[PDB]
Amino acid sequence: PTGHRDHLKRKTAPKSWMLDKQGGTFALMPASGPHKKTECIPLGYLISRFLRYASNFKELSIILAEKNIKVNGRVRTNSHFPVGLFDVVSIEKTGEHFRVLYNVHKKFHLHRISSEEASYRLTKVTKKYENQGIPYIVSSCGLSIRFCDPAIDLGYTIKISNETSKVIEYIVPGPDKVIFVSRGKARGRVGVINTISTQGKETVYGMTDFAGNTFSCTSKSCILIGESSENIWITLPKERGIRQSELEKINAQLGEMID
Amino acid sequence: GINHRGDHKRRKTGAKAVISRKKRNNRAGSQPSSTKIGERKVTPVRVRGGNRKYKALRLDMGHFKFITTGKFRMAKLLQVVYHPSSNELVRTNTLTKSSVVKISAEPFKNDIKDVARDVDPSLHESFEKGHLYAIITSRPGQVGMAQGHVLQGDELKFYADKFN
Amino acid sequence: KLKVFPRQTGVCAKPYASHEEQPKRRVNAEVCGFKAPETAYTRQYIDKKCPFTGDVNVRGRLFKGVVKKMKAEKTIVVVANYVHYSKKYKRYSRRHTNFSVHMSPCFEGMINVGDTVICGETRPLSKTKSSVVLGYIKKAL
RNA sequence: AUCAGGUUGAUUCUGCCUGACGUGGAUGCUAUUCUCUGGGGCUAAGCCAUGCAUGCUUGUGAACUCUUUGUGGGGGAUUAGCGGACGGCUCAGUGAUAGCACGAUGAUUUGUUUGCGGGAUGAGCAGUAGCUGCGGGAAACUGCAGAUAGUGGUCUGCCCCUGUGGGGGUUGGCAAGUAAGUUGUGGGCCUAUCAGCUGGUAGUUAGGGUAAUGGCCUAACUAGGCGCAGACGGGAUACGGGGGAUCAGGGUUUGGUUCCGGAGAGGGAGCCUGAGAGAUGGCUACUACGUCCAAGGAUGGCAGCAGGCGCGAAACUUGCCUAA
């Protein structure tokens, strides 16, 4: 036990992938690349469980070797390629576009979009370095972009072209904005910033759902997706990320309990 | 071979060691290379990751720097006169880091004539016998070369009291 | 009894300089709330293991203790107190841990057996030392 | 959230012994069906007959071969490349150097994956696999001659550290992701008919070695370091957790065994190739037991899946599979 492992047992697969407990002993192992390993799903599951296109694996490998898929406007033919949050999946025949999201139950979700919305991507700026006489910035999906503004720093959200891969414009975080929580206890919930305070080298955002509930979370689990409550830069899913509590779910089915 | 683990040492309280593993190639080491003077010989070794070190077995022609003017010259190595740790490394003419060597003085003939025989008169007396003193700040067993600077003033007096 | 010529790692002076005009000693201000002593500026010593004028970085947890011994060269023994909870009997017990700590020479005539010190965590410094003294508090009479 | 029987001629007590309820192993009688879930761990980490458990891809095209024939085709040997460090089995060693929890790496390396960067169509000589012949040996294995791709030296240029001298190298990169190494503190197995223990032992200064910090190793010098809040020793069926059983509460007992971490391949050592091994379906030696021979040599590793012997109170098929 000093050499890398190449297999996944099925009990250890992440809960967001929604895999049945039986159905074999193994699960697809994702490859290295764009996103982290705890924040991606293999490409081959998206085409046979979330679209139910291929019923098999002999068929799923006829769809990928015929070059019919494009992640972020770029053809992919590998079933282990990893796909992450806010990524566009395009399918030429039967023209369609999807964006990869979460539920409020914290599972994955494919959300259909239009064509002039399929030329976007939102990411956070994490690193920044200079090499060979050029200034770079590093995305949160892992890319480097050269020759951006000199006034983009760690934390801002940037908009990537997705057909030339170049920055368009960005968002600086401050009160009266919108947020998507990409991980943690509160994954898949949208809010509106109220206060920004500090602690021992931390920043915490007080938030407020689109229904009145309150909220709070560090700045490492949040991406800005809007300028104000009616200026969001992507299309949200059907439910908008509310997460009604369990008191408020039985009254829907049972009414109130007045004295 | 040489191995750099500490699984075989007595404990902080003095208790005898208990070993439950064979040695690992993770922590393997080498025998000391002993760089002598004369007729350059350097060897490339293959190290972890596929990378490369250069292990000098013999060397001539250091690459020294005159500090007051800031110019590099390539001189010739004559002999070793002081090593701070072991003086059995001076009887053998072995070149480690921070050993003081006696160097040939011709290539610095332009540089030394910007200093008078005023406050440094001990630098001008050895120049007329034909040699200067230098000191090595590279690691000849790890990079395959000697590289240092010439002693003047404060340094040259501190070390001169050592090797007489 | 020095064996090499004394000079801080990082600065480089010139051979024929004056004793009043030559480079300045570089010092710090340590983990945010600890200022360097004043015997760190006005003193001559070379310590590569010193937190202020040295080459070590302090990234880790800070702890407190009581000076128990001062008998080796630049190394003291500090005792730290703590407590453990028993579940079956519903009570605590008092316990201690021993540390070997690096004391730089800028604390020469300051710490005595019985004071309290604040130490920081470093990379391994010897077989038993992995921490350093940052400040102290002299005992009250 | 419960009690019964038993010391007396009769009595009230103290006190243990026994019954009444679960659970893991072995065993007697007796048995119709289907559905889920288990089965050589304890004794011998004892010894093993026979079969199977690891091979693929070409910008590579030999022998041979076709065509009325040419910078033509078929054919498939060998070069070159990738993998065999994972998967599977077991619990001897290890009482904390392992494992779990929270930390440091500003002290480090990372093939395949992703996005950027980077690349000698110059001279001049050596020379090989397959292939075509002569052969040795009981075997297992092997030699010599002939002629050719890739290829290997040396100059030339290119790049690097320098320069009022010179000296090296032969194209090897950056950032993410994935993996790996190193390191701090803390935890109820039993034992004082175990009370004092420790010499690379505790520290300083220099160098070597390493991918990297460090007595990891060496030279010189100081005299330290741990302990009834149990040191240093010795014992028992000691792999650690996630977990299991019992059941008012508080507690007691157990975990060889699906998932994650470690360690090992009869016993010890030492190494090569490679991004990664101190590898055992890799190599070399000593050592336990061996096996085949024409006698001079050559060889073995089921704690992989079936199976056999042995051991014991104690545990299944030498089956079918180009489907999930």
Q: Measured between CA atoms, how close is B164 to chain C, in angstroms?
A: 15
The answer to whether the CB atoms of C14 and B68 lie below 8 A apart is yes
Question: Cβ atoms within 10 A of the Cβ of A82, count?
Answer: 21
Let me know if C106 is exposed, middle or buried by CB neighbors in 10 A (0-12, 13-18, 19+). Answer: buried
The rounded distance, in Å, linking the Cα atoms of A101 and A237 is 8
B74: left (phi over 0), alpha (psi -120 to 50) or beta: beta
Find the Å distance, CA of residue C120 to C1' of nucleotide D41. Answer: 50
The rounded distance, in Å, linking the Cα atoms of B24 and A74 is 45
Q: Which residue has the tokens 């009990």?
A: A11
CA pseudo-torsion sign B46, B48, B54, B57: negative
3-state secondary structure chain A: CCCCCCCEEHHHCCHHHCCCCCCCCEECCCCCCCCCHHHCEEHHHHCCCCCCCCCCCCCHHHHHHCCCEEECCCECCCCCCEECCCCEEEECCCCEEEEEEECCCCCEEEEECCCCCCCCCEEECCEEEECCCCEEEECCCCCEEECCCCCCCCCCEEEECCCCCCEEEEECCCCCCEEEECCCCCCCCEEECCEEEEECCEEEEEEECCCCCEEEEECCCEEEEECCCCCECCCCCCCCCCCCCCHHHHHHHHCCCCC
Query: In 3D, which of B59, B127, B62 has the Cα closest to residue B93?
Result: B59
The rounded distance, in Å, linking the Cα atoms of A149 and A139 is 14
Query: In 3D, which of A11, A13, A35 has the Cα closest to residue A22?
Result: A11
Distance (Å) of CA C63 to CA A15, C35, C52, C117, C140: 40, 17, 18, 8, 20
Strand, helix or coil for residue C140: coil
The strand order across the sheet containing B148-150 reads B77-82, B100-104, B131-136, B148-150
Alpha carbon of residue A254 to chain centroid: 35
Chain B span 118-147 residues with beta carbon within 7 Å of strand D: 139-142
Q: Measured between CA atoms, how close is C14 to chain B, in angstroms?
A: 7
Chain A span 118-177 residues with beta carbon within 7 Å of strand D: 127, 129, 131-132, 138, 142-144, 146
B96 touches strand D (CB under 7 A): yes
Q: Report yes or no: A128 and A137 within 8 Å, Cβ to Cβ.
A: yes
Distance (Å) of CA B61 to CA B34, B74, B129, B152: 17, 6, 20, 21
Distance (Å) of CA A103 to CA A107, A188, A216, A239, C22: 5, 6, 19, 9, 66
Q: Measured between CA atoms, how close is B32 to chain C, in angstroms?
A: 22
The answer to whether the CB atoms of B98 and C4 lie below 8 A apart is yes
Provide the Cα torsion A118, A124, A127, A129; round to 10°: 50
Question: Cβ atoms within 10 A of the Cβ of C94, count?
Answer: 8
The rounded distance, in Å, linking the Cα atoms of C126 and B89 is 26
The rounded distance, in Å, linking the Cα atoms of A257 and B80 is 97
User: Which one of B154, B155, B159, B161 makes the best mutation probe of the C interface by having the most chain C beta carbons within 10 Å?
Assistant: B154
This entry's atomic model was obtained through cryo-EM
D chain positions with any atom within 7 Å of a protein CB: 85-87, 93-95, 97, 103-107, 109-117, 161-170, 172, 174-188, 197-219, 222-227, 229, 231-233, 250-252, 259-264, 269-271, 273-279, 324
Distance (Å) of CA A229 to CA A131, A217, B157: 40, 19, 76
The experimental resolution of this structure, in angstroms, equals 2.7
Question: Cβ atoms within 10 A of the Cβ of C7, count?
Answer: 13
A44 touches strand D (CB under 7 A): no
The rounded distance, in Å, linking the Cα atoms of A252 and A256 is 8
| DSSP notation for B66-110 | ETTTTEEE---EEEEEE-SS-TTTTTTT---TT-EEEEE-GGGTT
Closest CA to D109 C1' — which residue? B49
The answer to whether the CB atoms of B68 and C127 lie below 8 A apart is no
Question: Strand B131-136 and strand B100-104: pairing?
Answer: antiparallel
Which nucleotide's C1' atom has the smallest distance to the CA of C49?
D204
Binding-face residues of B in 67-106 toward C, CB within 8 A: 67-68, 84-85, 98
The token duo for C105 is 């020479």
The token duo for A206 is 């007080």
Find the Å distance, CA of residue A24 to C1' of nucleotide D324. Answer: 8
3-state secondary structure B147-164: EEEECCCHHHHHHHCCCC
Residue of B nearest to C19 (CA): B154
Find the Å distance, CA of residue A8 to C1' of nucleotide D50. Answer: 36
Strand, helix or coil for residue B50: helix
**B153 → closest Cβ in C3, C4, C15:** C15
The token duo for A33 is 């690349």
Question: Strand B77-82 and strand A190-192: pairing?
Answer: unpaired
Q: Report yes or no: B28 and B3 within 8 Å, Cβ to Cβ.
A: yes
Find the Å distance, CA of residue B50 to C1' of nucleotide D305. Answer: 39
User: Which one of B9, B13, B67, B123 makes the best mutation probe of the C interface by having the most chain C beta carbons within 10 Å?
Assistant: B67
Let me know if C124 is exposed, middle or buried by CB neighbors in 10 A (0-12, 13-18, 19+). Answer: exposed
Q: Report yes or no: B78 and B131 within 8 Å, Cβ to Cβ.
A: yes
Query: In 3D, which of A241, A243, A205 has the Cα closest to residue A221?
Result: A205
B54 phi and psi angles, rounded to 5 deg = -125, 120
In this complex, which chains have at least 3 CB pairs below 8 Å with chain C?
B
C48 touches strand D (CB under 7 A): yes
- Count the residues in chain A: 259
The rounded distance, in Å, linking the Cα atoms of A131 and A143 is 15
The rounded distance, in Å, linking the Cα atoms of A150 and A185 is 35
Residue of C nearest to B66 (CA): C15
Longest pairwise C-alpha distance within chain A: 74
Q: Which residue has the tokens 């940037």?
A: A158
A65 phi and psi angles, rounded to 5 deg = -85, -15
The rounded distance, in Å, linking the Cα atoms of A253 and A144 is 51
Q: Report yes or no: B82 and B162 within 8 Å, Cβ to Cβ.
A: yes
Strand, helix or coil for residue B123: helix
The CA-CA-CA angle for residues B101, B106, B107, to 5°, reads 90
